[PDB]
């Protein structure tokens, strides 16, 4: 989903920014003179195919001219696959690394300051609102991939990772894949969307028979994700539970958890604006709503969720920008 941006092409270098995660490898590049930023994603585990795509991009978008190509790598793979990369691209101007947290922040900051129609709020009440993007700072980034990293940015170039969590997209995809046997992330999202978590979850209402306003929770609030199930090829003979219900429950469970940790991190760091990055939302309305509600709920309106059109490309984008 290309972006129009006036790039500086003064050094006549074709910059291939790659971000090789645990699961997803992202590429950001701009054919010289195009004023277009282009983005692809392929699985990390298809490492061969990832390299074919890289050669293919040089072939088609830079006239097969290796000598003018600079590879800039970020994410774990910048170390882990560096040798393989150096070996597979003998003729390039060079392959260099850019630090992962710097990349994320550099990419996000760029989108926040330079790309119209990139940053948006979303809940079910309000719909989608595009932001017309130094009341920027400080801001939080919650980067949801397989796992979750949380970074603060106090000002341009001043950032740090303040924490993270092992309960991310990878937990969601993994649990629901094994349990319900969904084959796509899309399919589990559709299953979630039409499901009912109250079949598998304990609500406050189940415990109290009513609201619990003294602690600020309604009957419908979730007390225990999957709380009803102990209290009741393999799992198919295990299952007495609706797959869509399971998918809903676990999507709420993980999102709400991310929401809470984001909130707590924002709290500590006196941040109002929370940006969600990574591969997790994917413009999925329910997901964005759950995240926005969690932030709103915990902050009582005082803090705000934000999403990004190019949410999965923060790292690769930052890497790209470093090669200036």
- Residue 40 interacting partner from ligand E4C, its own copies, none (CB closer than 5 to 8 Å by kind): none
Show the beta-strand stretches assigned E in 79-132. 94-97, 119-123, 127-130
Asked if residue 147 binds ligand E4C (CB under 6 A), the reply is: yes
Of positions 212, 219, 269, 293, contacts ligand E4C by CB under 6 A = 212
Length of the chain in residues, anyone?
324
- Residue 252 interacting partner from ligand E4C, its own copies, none (CB closer than 5 to 8 Å by kind): its own copies
Asked if residue 195 binds its own copies (CB under 8 A), the reply is: no
Which DSSP string corresponds to 118-132?
-EEEEETTTEEEE--
CA angle 315, 98, 132 (to 5 degrees): 35
Beta bridge partners of 3: 37
C-beta of 37 vs 253, nearer to ligand E4C: 253
Contact 84, 92 (CB under 8 A): no
Asked if residue 293 binds its own copies (CB under 8 A), the reply is: no
C-beta of 44 vs 273, nearer to ligand E4C: 44
- Residue 31 interacting partner from ligand E4C, its own copies, none (CB closer than 5 to 8 Å by kind): none
- Residue 275 interacting partner from its own copies, ligand E4C, none (CB closer than 5 to 8 Å by kind): none
Interface with its own copies by CB under 8 A: which range of 29-37, 66-74, 132-140, 258-266?
258-266
Binding mask 154-193 for its own copies (x = CB under 8 A): -------x-xxxxxxxxx-xxx-xxx-x------------
At its nearest, how many Å lie between its own copies and the CB of residue 312? 15
Q: Who contacts 262 (Cβ-Cβ below 8 Å, separation ≥6)?
A: 140, 142, 150, 274, 276, 291, 294, 295, 305
Question: Which secondary structure element, helix H or strand E, spans residue 153, and what is its range?
Answer: strand 148-155
Contact 1, 49 (CB under 8 A): no
Interface with ligand E4C by CB under 6 A: which range of 84-92, 134-142, 212-220, 310-318?
212-220
Asked if residue 212 binds its own copies (CB under 8 A), the reply is: yes
Q: How far is CA 319 from the centre of its chain?
A: 17
Burial 249-258 (b: 16+ CB within 10 A, else e): bbbbbbbbbb
Give, to the nearest 10 degrees, the angle between helix 243-268 and helix 169-180: 170
DSSP for residue 138: S
Name the residue among 172, 171, 175, 225 with its Cα closest to residue 198.
Answer: 225
Instruction: Please report, as residue ranges, which positions from 1 to 40 form the binding site for its own copies (by CB under 8 A).
Output: 21-23
Interface with its own copies by CB under 8 A: which range of 64-72, 75-83, 90-98, 123-131?
75-83
Name the residue among 318, 306, 320 with its Cα closest to residue 141.
Answer: 306
Instruction: Please report, as residue ranges, which positions from 255 to 314 form the binding site for ligand E4C (by CB under 6 A).
Output: 256, 298
- Residue 115 interacting partner from ligand E4C, its own copies, none (CB closer than 5 to 8 Å by kind): none
- Residue 123 interacting partner from its own copies, ligand E4C, none (CB closer than 5 to 8 Å by kind): none
Asked if residue 228 binds its own copies (CB under 8 A), the reply is: yes
Asked if residue 42 binds its own copies (CB under 8 A), the reply is: no
Asked if residue 164 binds ligand E4C (CB under 6 A), the reply is: yes
Contact positions toward ligand E4C, by CB under 6 A? Answer: 22, 76, 100, 147-149, 163-166, 204, 207-208, 212, 216-217, 221-223, 256, 298
């Amino acid at each position: 989903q290309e972006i129009s941006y006036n790039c500086d092409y003064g050094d006549n270098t074709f910059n291939l920014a790659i971000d090789i995660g645990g699961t997803l490898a992202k590429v950001v590049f701009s054919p010289i003179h195009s004023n277009r930023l282009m983005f692809y994603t392929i699985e990390t585990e298809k490492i061969d195919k990832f390299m074919e795509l890289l050669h293919s991009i040089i072939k088609e978008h830079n006239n097969g001219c290796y000598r003018m190509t600079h590879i800039i790598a970020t994410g774990g793979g910048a170390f882990k696959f560096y040798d393989l990369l150096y070996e597979n691209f003998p003729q390039i101007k060079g392959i260099s690394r850019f630090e992962e947290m710097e990349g994320l922040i550099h990419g996000l900051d760029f989108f926040i300051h330079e790309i119209p129609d990139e940053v948006f709020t979303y809940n079910d009440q309000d719909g989608e609102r595009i932001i017309p993007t130094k009341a920027i700072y400080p801001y939080l980034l919650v980067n949801i991939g397989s796992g979750v990293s949380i970074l603060k940015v106090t000002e341009p170039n001043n950032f740090s990772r303040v924490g993270g969590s092992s309960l991310g997209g990878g937990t969601l995809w993994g649990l629901l894949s094994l349990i319900t046997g969904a084959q796509t992330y899309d399919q589990m999202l559709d299953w979630a969307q039409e499901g009912d978590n109250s079949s598998v979850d304990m609500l406050v209402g189940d415990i109290y028979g009513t609201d619990y306003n003294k602690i600020g929770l309604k009957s419908s609030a979730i007390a225990s994700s999957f709380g009803k199930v102990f209290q009741n090829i393999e799992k198919n003979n295990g299952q007495m539970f609706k797959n869509p219900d399971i998918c809903k429950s676990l999507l709420f469970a993980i999102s709400n958890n991310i929401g809470q940790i984001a909130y707590l991190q924002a709290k500590i760091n006196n941040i109002q604006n929370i940006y969600f990055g990574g591969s997790y939302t994917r413009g999925h309305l329910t997901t964005m709503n759950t995240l926005s509600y969690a932030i709103n709920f915990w902050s009582q309106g005082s803090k705000q969720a934000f999403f990004l059109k190019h949410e999965g490309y923060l790292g690769a984008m930052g890497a790209f920008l470093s090669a200036s």
